[PDB]
Design a binder for these strands. Structure first.
Ligand code: MG
Ligand code: MG
Ligand code: MG
Ligand code: MG
Ligand code: MG
Ligand code: MG
Ligand code: MG
Ligand code: MG
Ligand code: MG
Ligand code: MG
Ligand code: MG
Ligand code: MG
Ligand code: MG
Lengths: 260, 226, 134
RNA sequence: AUUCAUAAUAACUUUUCGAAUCGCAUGGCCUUGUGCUGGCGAUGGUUCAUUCAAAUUUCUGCCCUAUCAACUUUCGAUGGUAGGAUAGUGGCCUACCAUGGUUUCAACGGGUAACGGGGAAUAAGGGUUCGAUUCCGGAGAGGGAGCCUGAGAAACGGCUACC
RNA sequence: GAAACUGCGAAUGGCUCAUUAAAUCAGUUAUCGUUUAUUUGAUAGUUCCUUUACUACAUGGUAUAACUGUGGUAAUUCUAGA
C-alpha cells in the first residue's frame, strides 16, 4: 500500500535462488532493471552464494565497486542488480565469463564460457513497433531497444545481440523443428525442439516441445526461447543439456558415479 | 520600551529603551513600512526620519506585514513567508502573529533610518560595520568594479588574510560562472555529440532504406515471375 | 611432538579480493582448540605470505575433542589485507585499534539534541548567556 | 480484434523540452594563438519501451440466523444520451429521458465471543474444530473529516479543524 | 570538513486486527480503460514575437540561506528587524 515496496522478506524470495531458510529475516530485493524480479538473479546472490567469491554482502560491494564484475559488457556496480536469463557476466580477474542459463532442475547454473562466445548474447523479441519518425525497433527480453531491425524479424523470434554495440548480428525464426529452451513453468530448464505450435486466438499460445530422448511436453509460448535449429545451438549449453532425467534414473546415475 | 533602530547604509543597530509613553504615542496606530518623524521620539533625533520595519510584542509574537489589525491573530502560514520556517517540504502550520498596527502591547519596535538627522548617535552612525565578504560571480565582481566586458577577474578578487598563530595565509572565493577552457571543452563536446549522433542516425536511416529497396525488388521479382 | 598437523581444504583463489579462501581443520590429539595466533603463524609459513595477511575464524571444536574445523584466509599482501578485512578482525589481530566511541544511546541522544538547533547555534548560546545574567 | 503503432495537411498554446552543470587526464594539429579539434566519466532532460509497481477489473468460491420475505428507487436505485470530473473506464457526479435492478438456487435485514488465505489440531476413510500471530493480501494509527508536498499518501514518529 | 542552501529518502520497514460477510481475500482473467519516480535500453543538427526588428554565448540577471550584528517571549525544533 501507499507506494512501491523496497524490502523482500526471506521465504518470499524466488525459490530458485536457493537462499537458505534461516540466517536472516530478509532477502536481497533486486533493483529495477533488465529482468523481472521473479525471473532474475541478483549479483550478490551470484557472487556470495553460487560462486562463493564473497562471504557476505560487504564483500560483494567491495568486489562490485572496483569494476571487477561486468554484466553484458558494462560494470553494473549495483549490489542487487537484476541479472537474468542469457546475461553474460564478465569477471576481469580469473578470466572467467559466465552466461546465466538455467540447469535442468530450473535454477541458475554456474556456466563458464569463453571470451569469443561471451562477446554476444541472444534476445527473444517481445515486440516489433514503429517509433517516432517511423523508425522500426525491436524490444528483447532484457528490455533492450534495437532500432532498425530486419523486416523479417517478428515477435517470438530471437536476435543475436552484438553486446559490444546495440546491433543485431543474426536472427532465428520461431518455427517448427528448431531447438528451443524453456524459461518458465514447471518444465523450466529443459531443451528440445518444436513439434508444432497451436494458436488459441484470444490468448495463451501453446507449444509442443520434444527433447533429445523422444520425451514431449507442452508449455506456454511465454516460456519458449529460441536458441537455434536442430543441433548446433547458438550458445553453449550447460551440463545436463535439459534432458530431464527422472528421479529413478537420476538415482541410478548418482550411485554409479559416486560408487567408483 | 526597547526600540531596535537600524542604519542600513552603514549597517549598524542599537537598542533604545524609551520611557514616558507620550514620547511613544507618535508611533501608535501606524503601519509597517510607512515613515515616522523623529521629532517626538527623541531630543537628539532632530532631522531623523524613521521608517517602521517591524518588531515584536509582549509574549514574543512577531509583527507581520500586511495584517491591518492592532491585535494578535492566528494565521495559517505556508513557505516563503515571515514568522514561519517549514520543517517539511510543503508543510503548513498555524501561528499567532501580531498585527502591523503599532500599539501599547508591543514590547519592542524595529526601525529603519531613511534620513540621517542633525546630530550623531553613540553607536549607529559613527561606526561602519565592515562587509562580511565580497561578490563571488565573475560578473558580480565585474559590476562591483566596472572594469570592462573583456578583462581578467583573476587578479581583482577581494582577498582575506587569515592568521593562525604563526602562519599567515590569504584566501579568496572560488569564482563561479568563470569562462574556463574546461567549460569551453565541455561546450564543444556537447555540440559535437549532437552532430555526431545526427550523422550516425542519418547513416542508419540511409542503410535501412537501401535494405528496403533491395527487399522490395526481390518480392516484386517472384510475384511477377511466379 | 603432539602432532597439531593443521590441514587446509576447499582452497579457492579469489583475485577479486586478492586472497585465498579455504577450510582449516586441525587434528590435535591430547590438546584443546590450540589457538588462532599460532594457527595464523603456521598458516603464515605454509603459504609463505605473512602473518599480518592471514585471517582465521570459525573453528568449532568437534564433540569429543581432538578436532576443530574452521575457515581461513591468506591475503596476497598486507597492504590489501588492511583494505578488505573487517575492522573487528583487524582488532583481533592487533593490526588496528577498536575505536573507543561514545555509547549508542548517547550518540542517539546527542543527534536528537543537535536536531533542535538550527545552524551553528553560537548565537543562541550567546543569547541565553546574555538573558540569564542581564 | 481497434479510430492501434506511425505518418501527412490546416492551425492552436499564460509554449513543454531541445545541457548557461561537475570530475579526472589534460592529448593531437598548424596562421604558436593561452587559436582549432579531442577521451573516459558524473549529474540533469523530452519521448518511447523495460523494471518496480499502482489503480481499476472478469469468473467461481465465505460462518449462523426466516421469532429477517421482500429489498432498492425523495436525496442514483437499474439503464440510455450528452457533458463534467478523474490518470483513466464507470451513476463517479450533473442535466434530460426510460422504469428499471436483486430475491425461496435465501435478496434485504440481524448476529459474529469474523480481518481473508497459505495453513494448524484431530482423525481408518469421509469428516469436525481452529487460523489475533514468523509468509502473502487488506485496513488503521484515540474517533471522524479535510488537505500540502511529492512519481507514489487522503501519510498521522506530515499538517488543518472538530470531538 | 561543521553549518546551511540544493538533491534524494522519509509512502519502505515495524506494529495491530478495530472495522470489514461478494466486502477483504484465494485461484484465474483484462487494461484495445489508465498512472508510473527510480533502473535498463533507445532517443533531440530545426531554439528568428510575423527574418528580409536575434539579443553577450570566451557564457544574462537578482535574491537569499548559512554567516555578521540588534533583539522579543516564562516556555516550543518560535522567530523578527539590518
Ligand atoms: Mg534492492
Ligand atoms: Mg460518460
Ligand atoms: Mg449514463
Ligand atoms: Mg473483530
Ligand atoms: Mg489471520
Ligand atoms: Mg480480537
Ligand atoms: Mg494508514
Ligand atoms: Mg491508544
Ligand atoms: Mg490520517
Ligand atoms: Mg506514532
Ligand atoms: Mg509508522
Ligand atoms: Mg507497510
Ligand atoms: Mg534513487
Amino acid at each position: 500500500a501507499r507506494g512501491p515496496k523496497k524490502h523482500l522478506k526471506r521465504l518470499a524470495a524466488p525459490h530458485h535462488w536457493l537462499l537458505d531458510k534461516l540466517s536472516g529475516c530478509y532477502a536481497p530485493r533486486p533493483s529495477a532493471g533488465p529482468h523481472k524480479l521473479r525471473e532474475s538473479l541478483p549479483l550478490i546472490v551470484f557472487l556470495r552464494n553460487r560462486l562463493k567469491y564473497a562471504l557476505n554482502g560487504r564483500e560483494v560491494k567491495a568486489i562490485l565497486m572496483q569494476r571487477h564484475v561486468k554484466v553484458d559488457g558494462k560494470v553494473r556496480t549495483d549490489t542487487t542488480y537484476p541479472a537474468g536469463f542469457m546475461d553474460v557476466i564478465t569477471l576481469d580477474a580469473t578470466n572467467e565469463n559466465f552466461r546465466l542459463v538455467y540447469d535442468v532442475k530450473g535454477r541458475f547454473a554456474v556456466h563458464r564460457i569463453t571470451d569469443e562466445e561471451a562477446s554476444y548474447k541472444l534476445g527473444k523479441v517481445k515486440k516489433v513497433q514503429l517509433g517516432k519518425k517511423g523508425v522500426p525497433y525491436v524490444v528483447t527480453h532484457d528490455g533492450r531497444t534495437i532500432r532498425y531491425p530486419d523486416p523479417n524479424i517478428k515477435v517470438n523470434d530471437t536476435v543475436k545481440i552484438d553486446l559490444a554495440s546495440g546491433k543485431i548480428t543474426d536472427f532465428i525464426k520461431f518455427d517448427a523443428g528448431k531447438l528451443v529452451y524453456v524459461t518458465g513453468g514447471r518444465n523450466l530448464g529443459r531443451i528440445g525442439t518444436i513439434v508444432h505450435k497451436e494458436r488459441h486466438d484470444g490468448g495463451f499460445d501453446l507449444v509442443h516441445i520434444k527433447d533429445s530422448l523422444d520425451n514431449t511436453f507442452v508449455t506456454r509460448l511465454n516460456n519458449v526461447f529460441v536458441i537455434g535449429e536442430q543441433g548446433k545451438p547458438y550458445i553453449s549449453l550447460p551440463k545436463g543439456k535439459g534432458i530431464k532425467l527422472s528421479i529413478a534414473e537420476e538415482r541410478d546415475r548418482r550411485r554409479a558415479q559416486q560408487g567408483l | 520600551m526597547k526600540l531596535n533602530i537600524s542604519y542600513p547604509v552603514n549597517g549598524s543597530q542599537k537598542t533604545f529603551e524609551i520611557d514616558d509613553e507620550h514620547r511613544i504615542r507618535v508611533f501608535f496606530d501606524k503601519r509597517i513600512g510607512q515613515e515616522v518623524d523623529g521629532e517626538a521620539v527623541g531630543d537628539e533625533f532632530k532631522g531623523y526620519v524613521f521608517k517602521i520595519s517591524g518588531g515584536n510584542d509582549k509574549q514574543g509574537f512577531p509583527m507581520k506585514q500586511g495584517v491591518l489589525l492592532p491585535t494578535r491573530i492566528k494565521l495559517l502560514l505556508t513557505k516563503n513567508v515571515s514568522c514561519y520556517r517549514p520543517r517539511r517540504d510543503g508543510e503548513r502550520k498555524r501561528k499567532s502573529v501580531r498585527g502591523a498596527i503599532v500599539g501599547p502591547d508591543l514590547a519592542v519596535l524595529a526601525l529603519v533610518i531613511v534620513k540621517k538627522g542633525e546630530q550623531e548617535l553613540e553607536g549607529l552612525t559613527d561606526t561602519t560595520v565592515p562587509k562580511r565578504l565580497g561578490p563571488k560571480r565573475a560578473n558580480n565582481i565585474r559590476k562591483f568594479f566596472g572594469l570592462s566586458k573583456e578583462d581578467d577577474v583573476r587578479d581583482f578578487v577581494i582577498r582575506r588574510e587569515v592568521t593562525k598563530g604563526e602562519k599567515t595565509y590569504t584566501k579568496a572565493p572560488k569564482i563561479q560562472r568563470l569562462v574556463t577552457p574546461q567549460r569551453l571543452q565541455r561546450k564543444r563536446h556537447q555540440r559535437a555529440l549532437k552532430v555526431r549522433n545526427a550523422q550516425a542516425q542519418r547513416e542508419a536511416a540511409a542503410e535501412y532504406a537501401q535494405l528496403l529497396a533491395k527487399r522490395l525488388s526481390e518480392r516484386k521479382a517472384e510475384k511477377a515471375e511466379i | 611432538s603432539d602432532a597439531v598437523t593443521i590441514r587446509t581444504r576447499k582452497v579457492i583463489s579469489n583475485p577479486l579480493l586478492a586472497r585465498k579462501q579455504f577450510v582449516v581443520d586441525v587434528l590435535h590429539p591430547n590438546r584443546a582448540n590450540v589457538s588462532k595466533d599460532e594457527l595464523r603463524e603456521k598458516l603464515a609459513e605454509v603459504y609463505k605470505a605473512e602473518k599480518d595477511a592471514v585471517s582465521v575464524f570459525g573453528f568449532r571444536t568437534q564433540f569429543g575433542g581432538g578436532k576443530s574445523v574452521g575457515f581461513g584466509l591468506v591475503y596476497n599482501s598486507v597492504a590489501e589485507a588492511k583494505k578488505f578485512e573487517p575492522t573487528y578482525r583487524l582488532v583481533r589481530y592487533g593490526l588496528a585499534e577498536k575505536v573507543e566511541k561514545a555509547s549508542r544511546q548517547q550518540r542517539k541522544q546527542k543527534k536528537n539534541r543537535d536536531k533542535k538547533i538550527f545552524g551553528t547555534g553560537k548565537r543562541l548560546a550567546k543569547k541565553v548567556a546574555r538573558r540569564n545574567a542581564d
